Design a protein around this nucleic acid. Sequence first.
RNA 1: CGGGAAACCAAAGUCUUUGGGUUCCGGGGGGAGUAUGGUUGCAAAGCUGAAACUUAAAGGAAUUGACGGAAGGGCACCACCAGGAGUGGAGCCUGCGGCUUAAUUUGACUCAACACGGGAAACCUCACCCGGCCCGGACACGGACAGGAUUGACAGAUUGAUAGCUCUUUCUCGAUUCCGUGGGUGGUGGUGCAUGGCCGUUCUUAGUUGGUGGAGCGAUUUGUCUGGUUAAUUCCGAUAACGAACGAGACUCUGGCAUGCUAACUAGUUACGCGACCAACUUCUUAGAGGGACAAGUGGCGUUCAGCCACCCGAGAUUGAGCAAUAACAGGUCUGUGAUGCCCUUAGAUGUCCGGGGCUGCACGCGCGCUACACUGACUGGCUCAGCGUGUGCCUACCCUACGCCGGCAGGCGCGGGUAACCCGUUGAACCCCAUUCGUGAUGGGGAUCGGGGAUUGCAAUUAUUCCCCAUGAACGAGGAAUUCCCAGUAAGUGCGGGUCAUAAGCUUGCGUUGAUUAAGUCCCUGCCCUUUGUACACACCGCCCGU
Length: 74
Amino acid sequence: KKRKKKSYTTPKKNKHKRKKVKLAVLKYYKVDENGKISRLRRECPSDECGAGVFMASHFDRHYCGKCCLTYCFN
RNA sequence: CGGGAAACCAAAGUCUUUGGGUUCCGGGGGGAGUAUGGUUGCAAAGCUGAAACUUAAAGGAAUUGACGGAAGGGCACCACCAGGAGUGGAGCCUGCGGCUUAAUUUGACUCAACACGGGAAACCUCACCCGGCCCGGACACGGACAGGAUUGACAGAUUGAUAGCUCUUUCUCGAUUCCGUGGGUGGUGGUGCAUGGCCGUUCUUAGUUGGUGGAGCGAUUUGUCUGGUUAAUUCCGAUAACGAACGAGACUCUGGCAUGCUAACUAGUUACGCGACCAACUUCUUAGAGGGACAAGUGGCGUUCAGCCACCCGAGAUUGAGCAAUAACAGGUCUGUGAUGCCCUUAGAUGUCCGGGGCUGCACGCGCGCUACACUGACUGGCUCAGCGUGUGCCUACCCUACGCCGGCAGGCGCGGGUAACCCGUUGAACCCCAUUCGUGAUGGGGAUCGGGGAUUGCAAUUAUUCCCCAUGAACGAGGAAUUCCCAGUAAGUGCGGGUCAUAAGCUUGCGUUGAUUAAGUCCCUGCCCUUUGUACACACCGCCCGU
């Protein structure tokens, strides 16, 4: 009988903290400075979500989790 | 009388009611009858004879127990036996220590540990484990609000892993929470040397205890015993004991027996019955108010008592088990239980998630296990065979099973029955037998691996699940030292069913089937009990104790 001796890797770990900025700079912008503005996200043609569901942007396969939708030309 | 602590003593009496005369002599135990001085002796040694120091007892009598390589009498296959049978070595892997790093992993140190925790380890139960994350505070004090992170992406990877952990997106319940110390909603966290309750054992034997009365100053003893008898502290009897109380017996369950009884459309049936001249008042099975066996009859042994032996008769003539006395043990269990008293670690909570190394090695460190020697062992498939039992929703998603795809049958799919004496099933890949056979024993006779036919369908099985055939030839016919169990439906062979479970068994708990050589004795070994005796033991012989 010995101990588990789980020490050889990762003696201490730091909590991950996402630096989610409180200001609307990276997520959205207007680039117009007017009452009417242009939206920087493609319209979602699916009816399985709400009328204000706006998709985020990655390198590909825009990840939202609810749909896992990917733009494909079939 | 009397006296003594008593053992005992007519003296060890005439003693606190103390004085007949007189001599020697002791003052806790050791040091020590030692040192020294004197004295005697040829010598060995004799006589007289300290102290320093050391110690809380040493010692006497007796009482109970324990022990005895002490006696007497009994008893037990956890004992033995010119007795044996089967053994641990010849056919189905597990438990824990010896025993390389992720491998020898908690509790249990002879009987009273070691398929034991009903503990059959991938994993939820793995703490030896190559690796982590979602993390805890009714409060004592600290860091301060529309952000101070939650299991939650294949393709550049991870250390196996469709786990965002990649030094990665600034997707996503959204005020949920987090760090430093513990009480806490607790921890299968410690301590079973704090406990309860359950067990196990001393201890399977017959043992044990008041009341009142006797004995003793008393601890204590008698009762509870010289004998005979019994399996028995069972009885007869004896008797300073008499009356009692437990334990033993009785008792309960279970087997074994009815030209008897109570009755069954699930076993069982009678001449105005057919499908055949060419609505039995219940008995085999099932189960009930009863019966039956009492050493009852006879013979012989026994202060002619208790009882013992034998024999008819009888289904059966010490007949399976269960339950089981206070004191006991620092026996096991805190890991069965918001059954339960607090000294006290860590974030790598002994929580989850078909996820994941071992232990399924072979110079064995041990223990429980898996196995029959010949016309008896097994095939012709040529006659009606057994059980004991189990079987489908609070939880819950998991039950037992009756035809065909067809190679040759469980069976990958359709199919009905059974909450059960209704179905499985008069228990669906089974006797031990036999026109495949041994002529005197390595052949046909019982299998060393290990390969194919469709695999029950369990991710994995190999780091435990899953059939018989080609006859490929293994010391191929009573076994180191040490030994374990056992006396009639014992043993042993053999299969089957329950528990565990997913029909998971080499384990255990039960059940039938074939069927039994030896013994109706003993105290030799190991122990136990009813006495007497000894003890310088009482932590009780694993004791105590002596020696430079």
